[PDB]
mmCIF file of C-alpha atoms and ligand atoms in Angstrom:
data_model
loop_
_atom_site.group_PDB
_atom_site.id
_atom_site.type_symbol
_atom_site.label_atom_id
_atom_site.label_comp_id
_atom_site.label_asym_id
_atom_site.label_seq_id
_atom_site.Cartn_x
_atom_site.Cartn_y
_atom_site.Cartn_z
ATOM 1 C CA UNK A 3 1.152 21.205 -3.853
ATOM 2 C CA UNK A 4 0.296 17.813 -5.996
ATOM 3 C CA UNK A 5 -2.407 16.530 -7.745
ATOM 4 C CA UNK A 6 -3.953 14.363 -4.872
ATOM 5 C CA UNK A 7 -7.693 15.811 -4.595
ATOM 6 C CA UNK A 8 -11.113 14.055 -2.912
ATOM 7 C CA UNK A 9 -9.580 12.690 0.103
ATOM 8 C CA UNK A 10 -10.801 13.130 3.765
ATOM 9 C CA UNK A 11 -7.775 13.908 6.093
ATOM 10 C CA UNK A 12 -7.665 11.762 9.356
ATOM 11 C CA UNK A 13 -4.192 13.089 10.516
ATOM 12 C CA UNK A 14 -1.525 16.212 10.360
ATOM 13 C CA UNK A 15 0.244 13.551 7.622
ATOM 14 C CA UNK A 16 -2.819 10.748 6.750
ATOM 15 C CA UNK A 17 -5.508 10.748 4.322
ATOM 16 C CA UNK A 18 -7.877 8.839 3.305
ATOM 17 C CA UNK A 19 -10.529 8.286 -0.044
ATOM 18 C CA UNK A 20 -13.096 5.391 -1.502
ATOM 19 C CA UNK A 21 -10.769 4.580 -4.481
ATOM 20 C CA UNK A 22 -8.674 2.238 -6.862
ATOM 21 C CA UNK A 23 -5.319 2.362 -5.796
ATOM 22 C CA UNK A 24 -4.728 1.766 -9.597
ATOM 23 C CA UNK A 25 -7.226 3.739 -11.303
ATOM 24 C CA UNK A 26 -5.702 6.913 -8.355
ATOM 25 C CA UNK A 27 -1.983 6.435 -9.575
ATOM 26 C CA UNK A 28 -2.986 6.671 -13.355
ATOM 27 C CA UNK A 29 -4.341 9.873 -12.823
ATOM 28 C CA UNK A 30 -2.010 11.184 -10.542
ATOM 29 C CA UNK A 31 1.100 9.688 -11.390
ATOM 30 C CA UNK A 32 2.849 9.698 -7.964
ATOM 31 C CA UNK A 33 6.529 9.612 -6.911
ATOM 32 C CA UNK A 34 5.314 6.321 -4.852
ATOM 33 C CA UNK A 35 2.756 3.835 -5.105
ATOM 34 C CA UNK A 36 2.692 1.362 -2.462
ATOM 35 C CA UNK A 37 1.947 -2.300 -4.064
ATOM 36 C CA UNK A 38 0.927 -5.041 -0.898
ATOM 37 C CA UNK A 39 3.036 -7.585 -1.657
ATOM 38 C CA UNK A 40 4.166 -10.848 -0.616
ATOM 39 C CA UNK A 41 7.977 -12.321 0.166
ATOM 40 C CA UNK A 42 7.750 -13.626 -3.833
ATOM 41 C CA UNK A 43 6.987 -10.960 -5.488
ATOM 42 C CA UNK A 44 4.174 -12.928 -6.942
ATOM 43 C CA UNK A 45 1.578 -10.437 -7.834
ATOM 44 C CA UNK A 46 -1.490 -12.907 -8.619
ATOM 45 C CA UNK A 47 -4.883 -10.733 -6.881
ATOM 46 C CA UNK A 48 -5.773 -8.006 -4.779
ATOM 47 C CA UNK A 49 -3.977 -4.758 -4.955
ATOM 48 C CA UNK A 50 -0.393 -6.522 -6.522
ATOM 49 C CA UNK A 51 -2.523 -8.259 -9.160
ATOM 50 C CA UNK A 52 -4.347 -5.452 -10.333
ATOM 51 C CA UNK A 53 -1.223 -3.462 -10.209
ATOM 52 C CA UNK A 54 0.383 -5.244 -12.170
ATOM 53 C CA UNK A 55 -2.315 -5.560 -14.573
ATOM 54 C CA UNK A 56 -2.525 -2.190 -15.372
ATOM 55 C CA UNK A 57 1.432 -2.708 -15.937
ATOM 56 C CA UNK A 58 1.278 -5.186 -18.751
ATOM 57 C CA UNK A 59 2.496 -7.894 -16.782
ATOM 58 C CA UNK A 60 5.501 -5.555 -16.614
ATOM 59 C CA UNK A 61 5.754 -5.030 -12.838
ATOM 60 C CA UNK A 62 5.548 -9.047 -12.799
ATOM 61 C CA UNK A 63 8.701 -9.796 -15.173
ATOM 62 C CA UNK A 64 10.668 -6.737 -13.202
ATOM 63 C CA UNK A 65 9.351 -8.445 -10.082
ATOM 64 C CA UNK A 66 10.849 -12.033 -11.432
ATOM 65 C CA UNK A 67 14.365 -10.820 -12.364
ATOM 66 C CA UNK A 68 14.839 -8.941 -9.274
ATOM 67 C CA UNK A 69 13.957 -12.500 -6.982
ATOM 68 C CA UNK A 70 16.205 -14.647 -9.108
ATOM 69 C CA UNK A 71 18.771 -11.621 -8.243
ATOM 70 C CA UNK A 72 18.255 -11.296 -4.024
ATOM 71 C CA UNK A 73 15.867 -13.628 -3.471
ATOM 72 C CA UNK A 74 12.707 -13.228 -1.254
ATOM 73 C CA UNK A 75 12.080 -10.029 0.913
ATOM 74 C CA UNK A 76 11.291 -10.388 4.496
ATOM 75 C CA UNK A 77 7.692 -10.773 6.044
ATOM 76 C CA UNK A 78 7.438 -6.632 7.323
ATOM 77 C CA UNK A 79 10.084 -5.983 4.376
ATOM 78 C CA UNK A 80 9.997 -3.911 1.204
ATOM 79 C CA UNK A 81 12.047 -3.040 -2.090
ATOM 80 C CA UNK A 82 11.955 -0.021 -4.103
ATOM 81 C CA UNK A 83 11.144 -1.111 -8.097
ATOM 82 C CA UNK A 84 9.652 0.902 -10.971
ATOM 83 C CA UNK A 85 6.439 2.434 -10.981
ATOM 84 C CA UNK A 86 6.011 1.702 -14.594
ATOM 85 C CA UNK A 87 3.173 3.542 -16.251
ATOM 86 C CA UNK A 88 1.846 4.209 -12.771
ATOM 87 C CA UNK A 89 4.065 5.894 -10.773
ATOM 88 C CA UNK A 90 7.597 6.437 -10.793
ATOM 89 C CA UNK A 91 8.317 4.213 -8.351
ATOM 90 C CA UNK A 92 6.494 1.147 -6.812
ATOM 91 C CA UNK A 93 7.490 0.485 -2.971
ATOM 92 C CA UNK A 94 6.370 -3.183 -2.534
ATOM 93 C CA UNK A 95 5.791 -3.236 1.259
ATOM 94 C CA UNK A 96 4.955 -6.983 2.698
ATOM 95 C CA UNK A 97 2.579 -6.955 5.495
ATOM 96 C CA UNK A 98 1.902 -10.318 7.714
ATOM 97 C CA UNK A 99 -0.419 -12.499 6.231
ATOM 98 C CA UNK A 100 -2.572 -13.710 9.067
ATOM 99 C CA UNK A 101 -3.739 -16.246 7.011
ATOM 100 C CA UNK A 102 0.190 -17.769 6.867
ATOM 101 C CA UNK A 103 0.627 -17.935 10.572
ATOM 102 C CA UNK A 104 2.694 -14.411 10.276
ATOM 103 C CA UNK A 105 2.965 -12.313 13.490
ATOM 104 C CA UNK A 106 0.102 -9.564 13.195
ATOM 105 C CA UNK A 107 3.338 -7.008 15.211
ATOM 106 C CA UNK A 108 5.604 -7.325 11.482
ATOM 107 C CA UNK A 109 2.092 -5.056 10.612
ATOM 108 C CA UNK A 110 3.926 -1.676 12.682
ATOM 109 C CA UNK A 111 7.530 -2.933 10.745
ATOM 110 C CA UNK A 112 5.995 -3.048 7.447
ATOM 111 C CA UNK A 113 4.501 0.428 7.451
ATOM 112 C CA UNK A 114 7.928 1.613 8.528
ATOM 113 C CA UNK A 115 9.019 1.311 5.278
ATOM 114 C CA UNK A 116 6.606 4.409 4.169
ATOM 115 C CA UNK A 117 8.867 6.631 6.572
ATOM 116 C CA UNK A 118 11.613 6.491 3.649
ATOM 117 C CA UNK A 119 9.285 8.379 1.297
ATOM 118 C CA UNK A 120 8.303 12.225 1.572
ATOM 119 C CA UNK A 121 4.736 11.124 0.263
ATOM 120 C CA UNK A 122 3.186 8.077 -0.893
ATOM 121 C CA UNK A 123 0.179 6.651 -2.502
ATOM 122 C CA UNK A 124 -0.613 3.733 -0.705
ATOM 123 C CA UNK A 125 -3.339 1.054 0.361
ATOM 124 C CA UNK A 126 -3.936 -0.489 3.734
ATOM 125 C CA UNK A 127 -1.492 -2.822 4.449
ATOM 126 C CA UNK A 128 -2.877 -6.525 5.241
ATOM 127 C CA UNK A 129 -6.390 -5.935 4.732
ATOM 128 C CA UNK A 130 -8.408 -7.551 1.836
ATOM 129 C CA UNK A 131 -7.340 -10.986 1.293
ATOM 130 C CA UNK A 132 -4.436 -11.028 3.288
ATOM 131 C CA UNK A 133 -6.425 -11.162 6.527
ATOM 132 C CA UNK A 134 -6.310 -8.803 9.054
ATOM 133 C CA UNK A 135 -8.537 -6.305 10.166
ATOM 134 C CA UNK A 136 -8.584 -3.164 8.191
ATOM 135 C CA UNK A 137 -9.720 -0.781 10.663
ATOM 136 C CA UNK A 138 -6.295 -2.315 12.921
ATOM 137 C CA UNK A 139 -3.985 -1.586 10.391
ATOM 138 C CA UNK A 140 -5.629 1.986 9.626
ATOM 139 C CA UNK A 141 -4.791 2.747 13.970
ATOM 140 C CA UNK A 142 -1.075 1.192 12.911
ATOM 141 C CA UNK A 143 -0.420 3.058 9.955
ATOM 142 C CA UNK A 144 -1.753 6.653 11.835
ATOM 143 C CA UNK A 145 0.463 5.421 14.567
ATOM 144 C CA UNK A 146 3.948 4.736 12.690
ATOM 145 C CA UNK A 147 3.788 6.188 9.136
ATOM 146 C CA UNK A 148 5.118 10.230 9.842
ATOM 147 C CA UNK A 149 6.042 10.921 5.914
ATOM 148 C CA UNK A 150 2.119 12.177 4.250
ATOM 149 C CA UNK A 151 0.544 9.239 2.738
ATOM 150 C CA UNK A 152 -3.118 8.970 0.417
ATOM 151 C CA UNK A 153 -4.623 6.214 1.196
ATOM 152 C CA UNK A 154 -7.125 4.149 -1.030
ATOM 153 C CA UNK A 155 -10.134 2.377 -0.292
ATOM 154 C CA UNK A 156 -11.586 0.374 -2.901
ATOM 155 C CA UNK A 157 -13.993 -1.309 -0.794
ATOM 156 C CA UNK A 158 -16.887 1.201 -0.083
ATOM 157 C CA UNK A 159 -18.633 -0.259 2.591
ATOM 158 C CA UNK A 160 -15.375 -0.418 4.806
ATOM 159 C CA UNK A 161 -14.111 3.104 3.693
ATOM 160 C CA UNK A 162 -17.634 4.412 5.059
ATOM 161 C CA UNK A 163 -16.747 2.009 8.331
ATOM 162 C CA UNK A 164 -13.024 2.863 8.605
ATOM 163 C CA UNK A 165 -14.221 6.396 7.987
ATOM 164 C CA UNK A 166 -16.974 6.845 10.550
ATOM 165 C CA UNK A 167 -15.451 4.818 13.187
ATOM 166 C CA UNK A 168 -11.645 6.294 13.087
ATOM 167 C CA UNK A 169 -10.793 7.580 16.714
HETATM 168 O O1 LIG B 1 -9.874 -1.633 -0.145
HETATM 169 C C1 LIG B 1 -9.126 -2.416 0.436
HETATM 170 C C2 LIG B 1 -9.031 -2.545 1.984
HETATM 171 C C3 LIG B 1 -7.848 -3.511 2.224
HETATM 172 C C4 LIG B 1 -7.468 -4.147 0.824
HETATM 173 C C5 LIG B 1 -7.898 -5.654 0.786
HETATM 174 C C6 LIG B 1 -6.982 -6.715 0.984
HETATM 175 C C7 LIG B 1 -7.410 -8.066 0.942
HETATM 176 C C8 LIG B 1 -8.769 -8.379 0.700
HETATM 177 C C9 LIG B 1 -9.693 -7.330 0.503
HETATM 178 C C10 LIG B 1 -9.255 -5.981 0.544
HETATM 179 N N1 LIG B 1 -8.232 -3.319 -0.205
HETATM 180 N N2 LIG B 1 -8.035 -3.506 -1.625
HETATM 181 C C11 LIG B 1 -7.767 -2.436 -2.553
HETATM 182 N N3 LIG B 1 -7.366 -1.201 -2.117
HETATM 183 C C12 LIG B 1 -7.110 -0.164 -3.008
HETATM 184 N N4 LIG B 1 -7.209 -0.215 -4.349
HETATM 185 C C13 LIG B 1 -7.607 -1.446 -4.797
HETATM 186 N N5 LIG B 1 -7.804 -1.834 -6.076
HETATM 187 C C14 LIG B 1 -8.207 -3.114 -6.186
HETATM 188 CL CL1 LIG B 1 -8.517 -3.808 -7.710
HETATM 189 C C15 LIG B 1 -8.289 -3.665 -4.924
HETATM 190 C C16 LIG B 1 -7.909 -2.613 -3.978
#
């Protein structure tokens, strides 16, 4: 077993919990934590900022190096970097930003990437400020992710809607 505990499960391989991605991976110190990212690496807000927060700004400088080194990842694309003091490693998945113009289908691509990974710790992909609707990308990533992922929450009164209305 692991040290995941508290979460409701939706699926044979997805879970679910009302948490801080960041506050989950300090105490449980996955193999994989999921960081939404964009094609930059630019980890300013949401889920990538406060990542990289907790990091020190370390995530960020990792981030920079690898960019000047391959340069952007694709919209739906993802790289494998350290988890620093959070994990021991961080997947940085980029989902579509609706907001950009991006094509809401690059939503089913990006959660492909969590199929590489035996189990992840991981938030919904495009929701928050990037856009989309969070209860869409929960029916994509049930639909595509087959490896066991925890998902995190941190927004309580959509957890208790994503929850209640799953199908
Ligand atoms: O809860 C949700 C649902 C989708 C996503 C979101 C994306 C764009 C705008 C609002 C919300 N989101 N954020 C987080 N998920 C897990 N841990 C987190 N920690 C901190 Cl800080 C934020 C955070």
């Amino acid at each position: 077993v692991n040290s995941f505990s508290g979460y409701l499960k939706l699926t044979d391989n997805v879970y679910i919990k009302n948490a801080d991605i960041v506050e989950e991976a300090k105490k449980v110190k996955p193999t994989v934590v999921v960081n939404a990212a964009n094609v930059y690496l630019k980890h300013g807000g949401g889920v990538a900022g406060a990542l990289n927060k907790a990091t020190n700004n370390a995530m960020q400088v990792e981030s920079d190096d690898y960019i000047a080194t391959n340069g952007p990842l694709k919209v739906g694309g993802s790289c494998v970097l350290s988890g620093h003091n959070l994990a021991k490693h961080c997947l940085h998945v980029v989902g579509p930003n609706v907001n950009k113009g991006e094509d809401i289908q690059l939503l089913k691509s990006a959660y492909e990437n969590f199929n590489q990974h035996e189990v992840l710790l991981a938030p919904l992909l495009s929701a928050g400020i990037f856009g989309a609707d969070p209860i869409h990308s929960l029916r994509v990533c049930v639909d595509t992710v087959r490896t066991n992922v925890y998902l995190a929450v941190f927004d309580k009164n959509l957890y208790d809607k994503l929850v209640s209305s799953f199908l």
